[PDB]
Design a protein around this ligand. Structure first.
Ligand SMILES: CC(C)CCC[C@@H](C)[C@H]1CC[C@H]2[C@@H]3CC=C4C[C@@H](O)CC[C@]4(C)[C@H]3CC[C@]12C
Ligand SMILES: CC(C)CCC[C@@H](C)[C@H]1CC[C@H]2[C@@H]3CC=C4C[C@@H](O)CC[C@]4(C)[C@H]3CC[C@]12C
Lengths: 84, 380, 161, 388
C-alpha cells in the first residue's frame, strides 16, 4: 500500500538554490554538501505515516559499478535521525 | 547513554529478597540437622570463613574509591554462596544433612566465587554478582559431579580443582565485560586482608583431608612454601617493576604463590625442602609473570591462573613418583579448564544483559555508583 | 495518551514519532509526573538531534522540574557532553540553581565529568556558588575523590568565560 | 579537674586487685574464648570508628572500658555464683567477663561522642553490677534459656544505654551535629569490626552452650541466621534509600542483627530454615529501625543513639526473646513460657532502671563532660595528629 506514482525532482528551484540555474531548469544539478528537495507522489493515500516511513529507503549510485567501498553507492533511510 | 546510574530501588531489593525467600523454602523442604572434637572440627571451617570474608574482602580493596564495595560485596557474595552451595552440594551428591563439614565445603565453594570476583570487582553491581555467584557455584558443582561420574572419584574430593577453576572462571567473565588507581590507606587495609589469607592458607590446603598425618604434612608444606614465597615475592618485586621499587599490589597477590603451587600436592610432598623448592619456583614464576604478562585485564588474576596451572602440573609430576594415570589426570585438568571457560563465557554473556543496569564504563571503580554519600545531587 | 506517547518518544530518541505528535497538536511543554518535559528526557538520554529539534520548535529552555533542575542540570548530571554543548550553544543559563542550590558545574564535578566541568568553566560557570549546605563544586569533588576535577577547578581559578 | 580520670582509674584498679586477692583462686573452650575476645575488642571497637573525628576515642575507650569490665564482671559474677565466698577461675569465668564487657560496650554505643572516659568508668562499674544481677536472676531464678543472650546482653545493654542517653540529653544536639558525620576511610575501618563480629558470632552464641547437640545447634543456627541477615539487610538498605543506594550504617550494623535475634533460640531445635527466617526478620527490622525509629527517637523522644544500638541490639534482642517464647510454644525447648517472658521483661525493666540511676549519676558536672560544640571530637581527650 506504498506504491509510488511519480517523483518531482524540482529541478528549477533546487538548481536556483544550488547555483546551477544557468545549466538547466529541467535536469537536476546539485552541489555536494547542500540539501536538495524532492517530492514523492503516492498512488493511494498513506494511512499511517510512521510504519510507511519505516518501510522506505533511498539509494544513490554513481558510475557503472557502484559499491559501498568506493563511496559510489549509498543507502540511507528517510528519517529525522539521518546524518545531515 | 546516561552515565548517571539507573535506580536499583526496585531491582536489587526484589532480587535479593526473592533469592533469600527461595533459599529459605528450599532449606525447609530439603535440609535437616544431625562430640569430642566439635570445636576442633569447627576451627577449620572458621578459618575458612575468616579467610573468605576478611582476606578476600580486604585484599581487593586496594582501589582508591572502591574499598566499600569490595568489602561489602564480598560479604554479600559469601553469605549467598554458602547457602546456595549447601543446597547444590546436597542435590548433586545424593535429603541434605547440614554438618560442620558440609558448611566447610560450602565455604570452599563460595571461596571459589570470591577468588573469581576479584577479576570483575569494580566493573559490576550487586545483581551481576548475584548471577555470578549462582552460576559459578552451579558450574563448580557440575564440574565436580562430572569428574566423580567419569573418573570415579569422590564428589567432595574433586573440590581440589577450585584454584584453577576460579582463576579461569574469573578471567573468562572479565574478558566478556565492557572495557574501561590505588591509595595508601586502602593498600594498608588490603595488606591486612592479604596477611590473613597468607596466615590461614594452610587451612585451605587441608579441609578435605581426613587422616591426621596428611593434614600434618599438608599444613607443614603450605607453611614453609608460603614463607619462601613471601621472601621471593617481596625481594623480586623490584626486578619486575619499571622503577625498581617494591609494589604493594604485586606483594598482595604474590605472597600466596607458594600456597597455590603446593595446594594440590601438599599431602604428597614428603620433606619440607621440596615444599620450599616449590615455593621458591612459584615466587620466581610470579616475578616473571609480573614482568611479562602485561606485555602479552587483571595481571594478578593472570599470575594466579598460571600459578594454579603450575600447581596442577607439579601434582602430575609428583603423583608418578608416589603412564595411564598421567593421561587420566591431564584429562581431568583439561575437562576442568574447558568447563571453567565455557561457564565463564555463559556468565559473561549473562552479565552483559541490559536488565542488570550495569555501571557505565566511565563509572568503573567508584563507590559513588552503589553507595549513599552526603552533599550529592540525587535524581532529576 | 498523546502526551505520554510524545514523552516516551522523547525519552527513547524516536524523533520521527515525536515530530508526528507535535504535528498532530501535542503541546511541546508537556511534562511527566516528575516535571520532566521532552527536553529534559532527551538531555538525560543524550539525544542531541531530538534536543536541537525540540529547541527549534520553541520549547522553554529554562523550564525546571519538580526538583528545580533545568535541562542543563540534567545533562550535566548525566554527563552528556554534546547535549551540554548544544544547550549552552542555544543559551542555557550555566549558573542556574536548583531547589537545593545545585549548579550544573556542581553536578558535573560530583559525578567526575571532567569534559562537562571544563566546558562549563570555559562558558563562565562560577565555582564559588554554594548549595544550601555551603558546599562548592571543589568541595564535593574533594569529598568524592575526583582528583582530575579538583585539579582542573584549582588550575582554572577565576579565568572566567 | 584534669586529675579526676587518672585518680579514678588508679583507685578502681587498686580495688580490683584487692577484690581479686580476697575472692579469687585458680582448655577445650579456649579457642571459643579467643573468638569472643576478638569480638569484644576488635569488632565493637572498630565498629564504632565510623565517626570521622572520634576513632581514637572509640577504639581506645572501648579497650579501656572492656579491660575494666572483664575484671569487675569477673568479681561480681563470681561473688553471685559463690554466694559471697571464694571461687575459682576457669575459661568460663573469662567468657562471662567478656560478655559483661560486651554489655557495657553496647551501652557505650548509645552515648558515643557525648561522654568522657571518667563517665565511662563509672557506667562500666554500675552497669556491670546491674547486668550481673539481672543475668543471675534470669539464669537461676527464672532458669530461662538465653544461651546467646538476646535478652541479658543485647537488649539489656541497648535499653541501659538508651536510658543513660535519655538522662544525658542535650538540647543543642537534637538537630544534629557538625562532627556527627562519617568519613570514607572511617567507614572502611568500621567494616573491619563488622566483619570480625560477623565471622566470630557463632562462637559468641555457643561458647557456654552445653557440649553436645546444643553447642552444635548454636553454631549452625547462628551461622545461617547471619547468612540470611546479610542478604535481607542489603536488600532493605537498598529499599529504604533513594535510587536504591546502599547505606554504610545499614551494612555495618544491620548485617549483624541475625546474630542478636537468634541468641535465645541458638541451642534450641529451631532448624536452619527457622534460623534463616529469624535472621531475615532481624535484618529487616534493623534496617527499618535505622531508617525510621532512630530519627523519631532523636527528635521526638529526645533519646539520641550515636551508633544506633537500639536497631542492632534492642529490637533484635526483643525479637530474639519473642522468638524464644514462640519456640517454647511449638516444642522447640522444654523451658517454660512464663519464665522466658519474665526474663525478657526483667531484662528490659532492670536495664531501664539501672540506666536511669547511672545516667543521673553521670549527669553531675564532675567527670569532664564535653561541651555541645566539642561532642564527637578526639581532641577533647586525645592528642590528635596534624594530618589524617
Ligand atoms: C530506655 C528507654 C527506651 C525507655 C525509658 C527512657 C525514659 C525513662 C527516659 C528517656 C527519655 C528521657 C527524657 C528525655 C529528655 C529529658 C530532658 C531533660 O532536661 C530532663 C529529663 C528528660 C525529661 C528525660 C527524662 C527521662 C526519659 C523519659
Ligand atoms: C518476631 C516475633 C513475632 C517472633 C516470631 C518469629 C517467628 C518467625 C519464628 C520464631 C520461632 C520460630 C519457630 C521455632 C520452632 C519451629 C519448629 C521447628 O521444628 C522448625 C522451625 C520452627 C517452625 C520456627 C519457625 C520460625 C519461628 C515461628
Amino acid at each position: 500500500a506504498l506504491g509510488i506514482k511519480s517523483c518531482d525532482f524540482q529541478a528549477a528551484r533546487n538548481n536556483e538554490e544550488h547555483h546551477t540555474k544557468a545549466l538547466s531548469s529541467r535536469r537536476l544539478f546539485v552541489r555536494r554538501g547542500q540539501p536538495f528537495t524532492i517530492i514523492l507522489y503516492f498512488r493511494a493515500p498513506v494511512r499511517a505515516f510512521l510504519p510507511a516511513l519505516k518501510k522506505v529507503a533511498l539509494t544513490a549510485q554513481t558510475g557503472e559499478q557502484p559499491s559501498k567501498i568506493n563511496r559510489t553507492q549509498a543507502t540511507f533511510p528517510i528519517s529525522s535521525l539521518g546524518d545531515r | 547513554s546516561s552515565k548517571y546510574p539507573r535506580s536499583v530501588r526496585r531491582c536489587l531489593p526484589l532480587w535479593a529478597l526473592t533469592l533469600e525467600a527461595a533459599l529459605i523454602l528450599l532449606f525447609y523442604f530439603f535440609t535437616h540437622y544431625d562430640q569430642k572434637g566439635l570445636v576442633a572440627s569447627y576451627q577449620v571451617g572458621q578459618d575458612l570463613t575468616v579467610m573468605a570474608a576478611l582476606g578476600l574482602g580486604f585484599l581487593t580493596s586496594n582501589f582508591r574509591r572502591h574499598s566499600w564495595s569490595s568489602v561489602a560485596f564480598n560479604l554479600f557474595m559469601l553469605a549467598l554462596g554458602v547457602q546456595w552451595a549447601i543446597l547444590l552440594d546436597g542435590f548433586l551428591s545424593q535429603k541434605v544433612v547440614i554438618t560442620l563439614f558440609s558448611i566447610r565445603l560450602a565455604t570452599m565453594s563460595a571461596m571459589s566465587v570470591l577468588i573469581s570476583a576479584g577479576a570483575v570487582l569494580g566493573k559490576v553491581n550487586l545483581a551481576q554478582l548475584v548471577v555470578m555467584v549462582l552460576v559459578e557455584v552451579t558450574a563448580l558443582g557440575t564440574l565436580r559431579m562430572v569428574i566423580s561420574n567419569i573418573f570415579n572419584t569422590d564428589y567432595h574430593m574433586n573440590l581440589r580443582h577450585f584454584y584453577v577453576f576460579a582463576a579461569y572462571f574469573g578471567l573468562t567473565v572479565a574478558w566478556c565485560l565492557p572495557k574501561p588507581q590505588r591509595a595508601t590507606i586502602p593498600s594498608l587495609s588490603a595488606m591486612l586482608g592479604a596477611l590473613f589469607l597468607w596466615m590461614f592458607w594452610p587451612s585451605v590446603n587441608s579441609p578435605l583431608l581426613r587422616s591426621p598425618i596428611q593434614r600434618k604434612n599438608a599444613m607443614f608444606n603450605t607453611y614453609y612454601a608460603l614463607a619462601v614465597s613471601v621472601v621471593t615475592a617481596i625481594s623480586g618485586s623490584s626486578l619486575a617493576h619499571p622503577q625498581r621499587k617494591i609494589s604493594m599490589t604485586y606483594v598482595h597477590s604474590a605472597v600466596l604463590a607458594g600456597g597455590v603451587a603446593v595446594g594440590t600436592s601438599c599431602h604428597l610432598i614428603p620433606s619440607p625442602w621440596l615444599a620450599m623448592v616449590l615455593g621458591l619456583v612459584a615466587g620466581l614464576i610470579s616475578i616473571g609473570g609480573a614482568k611479562c604478562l602485561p606485555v602479552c585485564i587483571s595481571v594478578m588474576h593472570s599470575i594466579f591462573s598460571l600459578l594454579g596451572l603450575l600447581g596442577e602440573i607439579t601434582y602430575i609430576v609428583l603423583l608418578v613418583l608416589h603412564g595411564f594415570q598421567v593421561l587420566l589426570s591431564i584429562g581431568e585438568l583439561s575437562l576442568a579448564i574447558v568447563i571453567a571457560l565455557t561457564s565463564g563465557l555463559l556468565t559473561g554473556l549473562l552479565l552483559n544483559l541490559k536488565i542488570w543496569k550495569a555501571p557505565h564504563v566511565a563509572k568503573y571503580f567508584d563507590d559513588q555508583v552503589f553507595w549513599k554519600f552526603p552533599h550529592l545531587a540525587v535524581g532529576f | 495518551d498523546a502526551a505520554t506517547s510524545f514523552l516516551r518518544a522523547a525519552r527513547s530518541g524516536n524523533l520521527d514519532k515525536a515530530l508526528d505528535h507535535l504535528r498532530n497538536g501535542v503541546d511541546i511543554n508537556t511534562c511527566n509526573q516528575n516535571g520532566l518535559n521532552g527536553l529534559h528526557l532527551a538531555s538525560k538520554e543524550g539525544h542531541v538531534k531530538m534536543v536541537v529539534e525540540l529547541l527549534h520548535k520553541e520549547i522553554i529552555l529554562e523550564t525546571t522540574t519538580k526538583k528545580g533542575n533545568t535541562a542543563l542540570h540534567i545533562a550535566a548530571l548525566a554527563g552528556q557532553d554534546e547535549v551540554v554543548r548544544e544547550l549552552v550553544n542555544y543559551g542555557a543559563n550555566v549558573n542556574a540553581q536548583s531547589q537545593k542550590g545545585f549548579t550544573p558545574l556542581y553536578m558535573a564535578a560530583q559525578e567526575n565529568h571532567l569534559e562537562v566541568v571544563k566546558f562549563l568553566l570555559e562558558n563562565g560557570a562560577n565555582q564559588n556558588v554554594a548549595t544550601e549546605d555551603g558546599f562548592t563544586p571543589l568541595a564535593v569533588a574533594l569529598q568524592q575523590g575526583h582528583e582530575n576535577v579538583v585539579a582542573h577547578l584549582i588550575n582554572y581559578g577565576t579565568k572566567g568565560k | 579537674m584534669r586529675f579526676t580520670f587518672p585518680l579514678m582509674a588508679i583507685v578502681l584498679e587498686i580495688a580490683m586487685i584487692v577484690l581479686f586477692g580476697l575472692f579469687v583462686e585458680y582448655f577445650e573452650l579456649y579457642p571459643l574464648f579467643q573468638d569472643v575476645h576478638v569480638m569484644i575488642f576488635v569488632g565493637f571497637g572498630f565498629l564504632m570508628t565510623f565517626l570521622k573525628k572520634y576513632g581514637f576515642s572509640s577504639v581506645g575507650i572501648n579497650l579501656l572500658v572492656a579491660a575494666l569490665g572483664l575484671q569487675w564482671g569477673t568479681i561480681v559474677q563470681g561473688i553471685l555464683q559463690s554466694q559471697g565466698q571464694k571461687f575459682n577461675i576457669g575459661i568460663k569465668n573469662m567468657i562471662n567477663a567478656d560478655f559483661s564487657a560486651a554489655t557495657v560496650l553496647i551501652s557505650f554505643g548509645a552515648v558515643l561522642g557525648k561522654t568522657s572516659p571518667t563517665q565511662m568508668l563509672i557506667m562500666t562499674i554500675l552497669e556491670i553490677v546491674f547486668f550481673a544481677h539481672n543475668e543471675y536472676l534470669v539464669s537461676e531464678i527464672f532458669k530461662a534459656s538465653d544461651i546467646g543472650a538476646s535478652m541479658t546482653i543485647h537488649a539489656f545493654g541497648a535499653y541501659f544505654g538508651l536510658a543513660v542517653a535519655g538522662i544525658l540529653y542535650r538540647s543543642g544536639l537534637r538537630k544534629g551535629h557538625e562532627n556527627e558525620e562519617s568519613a570514607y576511610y572511617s567507614d572502611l575501618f568500621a567494616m573491619i569490626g563488622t566483619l570480625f563480629l560477623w565471622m566470630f558470632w557463632p562462637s559468641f552464641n555457643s561458647a557456654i552452650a552445653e557440649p553436645g547437640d546444643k553447642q552444635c545447634r548454636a553454631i549452625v543456627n547462628t551461622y545461617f541466621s547471619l547468612a540470611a541477615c546479610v542478604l535481607t539487610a542489603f536488600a532493605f538498605s537498598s529499599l529504604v534509600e533513594h535510587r536504591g543506594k546502599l547505606n554504610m550504617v545499614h551494612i555495618q550494623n544491620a548485617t549483624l542483627a541475625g546474630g542478636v535475634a537468634v541468641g535465645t533460640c541458638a541451642d534450641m531445635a529451631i532448624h536452619p530454615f527457622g534460623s534463616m527466617i529469624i535472621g531475615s526478620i532481624a535484618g529487616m527490622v534493623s534496617v527499618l529501625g535505622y531508617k525510621f525509629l532512630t530519627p523519631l527517637f532523636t527528635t521526638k523522644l529526645r533519646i539520641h543513639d550515636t551508633c544506633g544500638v537500639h536497631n542492632l541490639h534492642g529490637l533484635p534482642g526483643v525479637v530474639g526473646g519473642l522468638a524464644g517464647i514462640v519456640a517454647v510454644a511449638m516444642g522447640a525447648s522444654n523451658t517454660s513460657m512464663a519464665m522466658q517472658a519474665a526474663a525478657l521483661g526483667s531484662s528490659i525493666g532492670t536495664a531501664v532502671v539501672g540506666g536511669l540511676m547511672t545516667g543521673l549519676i553521670l549527669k553531675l558536672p564532675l567527670w569532664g563532660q564535653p561541651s555541645d560544640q566539642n561532642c564527637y571530637d578526639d581532641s577533647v581527650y586525645w592528642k590528635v595528629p596534624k594530618t589524617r
